[PDB]
Amino acid sequence: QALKKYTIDLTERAEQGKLDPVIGRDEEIRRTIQVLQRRTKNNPVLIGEPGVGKTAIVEGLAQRIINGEVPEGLKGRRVLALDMGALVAGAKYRGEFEERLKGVLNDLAKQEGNVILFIDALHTMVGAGKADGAMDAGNMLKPALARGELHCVGATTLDEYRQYIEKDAALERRFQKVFVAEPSVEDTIAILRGLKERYELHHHVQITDPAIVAAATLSHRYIADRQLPDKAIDLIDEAASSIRMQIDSKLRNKVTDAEIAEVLARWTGIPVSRMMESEREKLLRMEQELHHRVIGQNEAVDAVSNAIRRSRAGLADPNRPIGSFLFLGPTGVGKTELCKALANFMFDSDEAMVRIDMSEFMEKHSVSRLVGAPPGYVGYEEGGYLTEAVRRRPYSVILLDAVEKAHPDVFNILLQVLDDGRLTDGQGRTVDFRNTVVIMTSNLGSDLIQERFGELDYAHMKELVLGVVSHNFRPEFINRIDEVVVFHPLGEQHIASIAQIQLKRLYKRLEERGYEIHISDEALKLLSENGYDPVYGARPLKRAIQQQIENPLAQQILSGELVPGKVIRLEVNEDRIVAVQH
Amino acid sequence: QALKKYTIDLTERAEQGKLDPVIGRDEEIRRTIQVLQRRTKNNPVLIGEPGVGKTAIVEGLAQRIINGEVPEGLKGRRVLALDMGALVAGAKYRGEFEERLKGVLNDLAKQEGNVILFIDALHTMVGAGMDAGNMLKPALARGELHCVGATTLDEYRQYIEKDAALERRFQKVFVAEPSVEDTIAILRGLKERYELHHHVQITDPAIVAAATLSHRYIADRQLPDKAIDLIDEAASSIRMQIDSKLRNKVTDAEIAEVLARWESEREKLLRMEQELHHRVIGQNEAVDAVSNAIRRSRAGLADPNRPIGSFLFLGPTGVGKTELCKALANFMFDSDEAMVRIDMSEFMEKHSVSRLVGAPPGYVGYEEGGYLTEAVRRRPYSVILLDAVEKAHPDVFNILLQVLDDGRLTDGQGRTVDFRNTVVIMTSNLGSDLIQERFGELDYAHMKELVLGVVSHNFRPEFINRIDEVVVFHPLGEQHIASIAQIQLKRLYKRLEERGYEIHISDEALKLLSENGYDPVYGARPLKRAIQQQIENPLAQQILSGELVPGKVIRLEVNEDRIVAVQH
Amino acid sequence: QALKKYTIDLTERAEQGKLDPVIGRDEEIRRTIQVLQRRTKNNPVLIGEPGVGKTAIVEGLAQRIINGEVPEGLKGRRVLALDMGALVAGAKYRGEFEERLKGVLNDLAKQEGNVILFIDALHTMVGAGMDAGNMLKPALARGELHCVGATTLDEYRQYIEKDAALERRFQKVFVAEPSVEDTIAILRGLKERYELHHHVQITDPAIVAAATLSHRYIADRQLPDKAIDLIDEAASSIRMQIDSKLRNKVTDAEIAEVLARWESEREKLLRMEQELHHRVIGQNEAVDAVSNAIRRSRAGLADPNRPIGSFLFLGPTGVGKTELCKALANFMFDSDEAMVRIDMSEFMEKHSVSRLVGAPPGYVGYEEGGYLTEAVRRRPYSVILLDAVEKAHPDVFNILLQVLDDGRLTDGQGRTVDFRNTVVIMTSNLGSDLIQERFGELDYAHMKELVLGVVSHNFRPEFINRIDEVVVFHPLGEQHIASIAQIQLKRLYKRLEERGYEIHISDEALKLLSENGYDPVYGARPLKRAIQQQIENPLAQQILSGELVPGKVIRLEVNEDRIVAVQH
């Protein structure tokens, strides 16, 4: 009949057992039954945020009907998953949709109060038969709803509920709101323990139950895209397919929690991966790798090494971010170099990061540049720069440079940030900063540091510059810092080592060009004499390397003088540096 | 069948072996096997720019099925492909999209899930008038659908990441543009099929030349599509050259011909001094300095996070400073149209910076945008021109330091504006009379050092630290500017010969034209407008009276203080 | 045969001369053979225009096939024009027309590549009404189709390229517009055809005049089809002149009569100032600038690929910029109420672009057009008015740069909108108070320079370089007020003579008006409402009183200050 054409019996499928076991949801199914045994407006609607198991509530109710675990008034009923695409499709003629829907309604009256109706996507039922001068499904179902003589069950997302049903109050009051919350962690672990049998029967592999509880735990903590139980189910399924292809292509036979971590790190790259000996010996050689690019300035290397080790070691403060820092020193001591060193350690690249230089924000209102603009105003549909740049890749490094340049009340934003890792952009959603490192640099007591780094300890220098910082900032803000570090002007040996590093990357780029070039150490001594001052550090070394290398060497390369394969000693002139061809 | 209406079997031709021997992109096929062997959510989607061979990915998967190179759950499948461009274009009224859609769904339910479907342009599925998310999203969750999606990330997040319920089923597979060497590997995998088609041979140096030049010069279509197109059309051209009335191997010469029509790079960089004197007379040392700086930028020794060249320009304005920038843009990248003239005379405030970089959101000039950075974003290979940089607000120099340090600049709207492909020209006139009054017999270098010390007392030292070289722009004499006036007369005669008039000139008339608007204080454009307004206005007055005839010799003979036109 | 039902062979028509003589186009048919000589994407498609001989390119292909002017692999191939409606005309069943289509496709598979087909309007096969385009798409993606398409770039870009398998069987084979000389050669190919039809003769100076004046004065109708139109319409005109109640040679004067029906102002142009000061008194520098423009453009000193006059009328209110526009309409265009009046000052909205331009498919302004380019599509020869430029959007300025670049417009649907013959002058005021103070005691040059600096602060710098000339309107002197007051008295005399009343004035009353309604600081309309009040209000008091008998002279006598009309 017409019920055969447009409806699908879920209860016959659960009678075949071809539906999923549904475990839990007891108050939700009980209130759904309480609404379904009424006199007027029998119709519960499963308002719940997208992917918390709303279809599975009705499927589990169908299974409880088949098992006979319902009250006596529901024993022997039929749940029919109504189809909207079956009804819209065949009707470009006038009245043909209304013909079908009225025939369905007369069949449902004919079934004598035995058919439970399930309508997935109730928001699809709203704009259903919207042809020019045509009733939708609302204008035809709406009689039989509030006489109680239809046993509809809605299932809709809450954002679809606002736009598509709360806009139409008449059909909005015909139903009964059933909030279906995202489950907490422990109950989701229980549900996943229920569903282990299905995936074991599907992929013929086994699952570690610690991997299950780790998938639920890490999914609730780190992934902010989807919602429970959906994200954890997808973790388990994708791990199962990965193990199946590891076996079948070319080891193991189960699904460990390390496989869960590999799935999560493949999905984003938050380094939940366990400390393998390459990674763990890398992490124990933290300061050694930081002094592969940054000579000197030991104490901040120590502090950030400590913070990243406490992050990776499973001792993360789960609400504050990784490290809430503050760098302080005179101009040109490689503060940005240390930040690029962290980026290169973490991501194998300097500019795989976000640097936002706060000298651009010397006015107040650029707060709205990084957090966005409210509803109504100009740049609403774009988001703040900082929030979006986190919202793509949350495991990153957020760098603020020249923090003395901006207005003091930009730093209520970072009060939020360093309190909880939370930030709310102009559209009004939270952005998790629990995988970020915040570094702020200034040159506050640079006169005081250049004056008194000699003949003083590190500690009371930090004390005195902290007093200067309290003269600068707010007591709220500097409480949020994990650790304030102090930089110092470098000796000439540090600048000679930096010149060695610049010669290393120069010879790297000239082997890329294809030239075997060496240097006299006297030329290194002359370059150390040239770009040196205690007041400015190595940016004079930058310009000295720039001029006295990049001008004559590249001038003689383009002069046809430098032949590849020749030994090229960068020896000295009387006042300059000369290359040879030997 | 309704399968004989909108579906395409690729296991058909792959069982026949009559498709592309798809080589490469193994990992994307592997992740497609990862998604398709799940229990649920078995509809992978492919993400990339159009023309990256996603159809070839599906066909190579089909060939691995035919070859038995797949695990034992992918076998017996039938590769199908549904149109998203006829289910709507045929759809007149209510339910012709949905009618065909449910007919496809039931006829695949007859197929009992042994069928893999392809769908391109997943963005088209969302908006068609409701349509298909509400009818495939059950099959997306039922698992009986075995779709293969294909679209681009921008349409994906514009349309499809709106509804997260549609987002949670499809699994993103990034298919980027392949490299030039991956293109080489694919074409070496496909040179056999070409040479068996046209019965010719193919030069593999011409293959790598075609790949490199297609990567460099043309960015309309991309790899591997443009390489296939250029190889096939060049092979067609060689085939016509054979069958016209002689080589079978397609050469890179025909590649360059179809390239430019349908190589002067390296030595043009080497001869850049001659290039700068192709249109500009005088300023020989400045020409040499600019050409050496260009070659050093192309030498590939400097910072890969710093631009082509940092420059500050001084001297008397209007003498060819802008003309140097025009010819520099011409023989640098294209022509006289990749440049932005910017007066720093205006910008003297904080909202000056908010103008030029970009407004914060919620404010006045936001999607009107920054005056500089939007024009950079439109023309990523240009030359940036600045005028009267001493009239700037001091915080603009912080932005300039960000330019010369990082080669990039976050605008007000919040994105990356790269600067490593342009030339920063900043013009000033602070040491004007230091160069003008001391033009006589003083060298280029010590005048440069003297005005360098002067501007060092003027500007910030850290600002001019970043500047590579400040050329002098010495005031050109009467002979150079007279020659420029002669070149303007030449292009004037060119346009009037386009109109079609044999026009001569007296040399005394040439001297009076050179002495109309010569001025060392203002520039060459006073001479230009002087000669222009003297000649042009009585000319057409004589013309449209009915006096001048095309073909008559028009000598610009002198009057006592004017120039008269004769018809002989 | 079933192929003999409703197919039109073209190889026999080229063999038996039943086609038309197709002349030239070697490179296009060469690349056609190139697309024919490929392994993939083997079918070409004539991306073309309304009236550029796409079917004639098909005819020339068939002519070169029969003449042996093709390669050996394509000689003797069957070229049949499949007729669309002829299959439709003998069919009335859903399954008989489709039966015919299936049978012809099976016969095309049966002929085994010998048939090389052609079907124009491939988009029409996509939407004819299983539609026929998606029915032939298996013949696309089964390696059997040798057909050729023909359409506009819009339908190829939207209905074909956006489809997938319909993309990867074709190319962007673009039909070019031919030259004027090629058009004359084709006219020589079919001069004798029209002459033997209409029993007339055609002069070859009339041929070259028809082609050249169609190339210049016509842009919507196109080469070569506009020449077809003009020649055949002139032939019918000469046939009328014979059969009226004599000539047989079609002259170029007949082409001029055709073009005008669908004259001594060149030396009146030397009396420009006379007519301008007849309508717009004073403002001598603007008169000189407009005179220089009209001289140097109709004589053609600059590029004639531009609109003729591109001015920014600047100055305070009440200077008659609108009056000078209407005076130019009177002089050059002889039609005062033929001008395209659209103000800039509605268009700061982002969504104004629909109405102010013309729309791509995706707007509802696509369902009527853009009201500017609609007006140029109606009126391709007039003055377009853009008042108050200071209230615009910057993309509208980019549209202005498109106008100042092309001399035409590739509009919102990519079709013909032409701009060379039209004269677009925008008006503004932005140098208002500078002129209102310092037009006195200053020159015209430095004022122009300073207001140019002001507009440079307003606009883009090279945008206002594209102005024909920055022109200056200014306050006016004493006698100009009296002359224009005499003009307004004349139109008052005309209005009341059409009422039936005849008016004499005292010159004392003229001096009373010139001393009452006077200040140059604002504009003209203080004088206009002074006239209005101090004349009409006692006059409307007297006439609606029923007192004034017609015939008696209405003498504008004076009081000490006021104006009295008497009846003696």
Ligand SMILES: Nc1ncnc2c1ncn2[C@@H]1O[C@H](COP(=O)(O)OP(=O)(O)OP(O)(O)=S)[C@@H](O)[C@H]1O
């Ligand atoms: N209590 C539960 N017991 C067993 N499986 C569950 C339970 N809750 C959710 N699931 C599973 O969670 C997955 C997703 O739930 P679904 O109901 O299918 O998604 P959904 O509720 O339709 O969300 P939307 O609205 O479609 S985005 C399914 O595989 C369900 O089997």
Ligand SMILES: Nc1ncnc2c1ncn2[C@@H]1O[C@H](COP(=O)(O)OP(=O)(O)OP(O)(O)=S)[C@@H](O)[C@H]1O
């Ligand atoms: N690994 C490969 N081996 C062989 N051919 C390839 C390979 N990768 C790409 N191709 C070819 O490259 C061309 C690209 O065409 P498409 O498959 O249509 O590109 P696409 O990624 O599908 O994007 P669009 O939107 O469909 S054009 C096809 O002719 C493929 O056969």
Ligand SMILES: Nc1ncnc2c1ncn2[C@@H]1O[C@H](COP(=O)(O)OP(=O)(O)OP(O)(O)=S)[C@@H](O)[C@H]1O
């Ligand atoms: N210079 C003038 N010569 C003659 N009539 C003028 C002049 N200036 C204004 N008018 C009169 O003013 C009206 C023309 O409209 P207006 O907008 O005033 O033109 P306009 O001179 O351009 O002033 P603006 O700048 O457009 S506000 C008509 O009544 C004209 O007769």
Ligand SMILES: Nc1ncnc2c1ncn2[C@@H]1O[C@H](COP(=O)(O)OP(=O)(O)O)[C@@H](O)[C@H]1O
């Ligand atoms: N310890 C160091 N290691 C490597 N480079 C350094 C070091 N100290 C200074 N430099 C050089 O000096 C510059 C200092 O950079 P940055 O940290 O931005 O200076 P500031 O201290 O003003 O922030 C760098 O560009 C780098 O080239």
Ligand SMILES: Nc1ncnc2c1ncn2[C@@H]1O[C@H](COP(=O)(O)OP(=O)(O)O)[C@@H](O)[C@H]1O
């Ligand atoms: N070389 C030529 N020889 C003869 N006629 C030509 C030639 N080129 C173009 N034509 C004419 O141009 C006309 C336009 O042809 P067609 O492409 O069918 O129109 P449209 O471009 O409007 O579709 C044809 O009638 C044809 O006679």
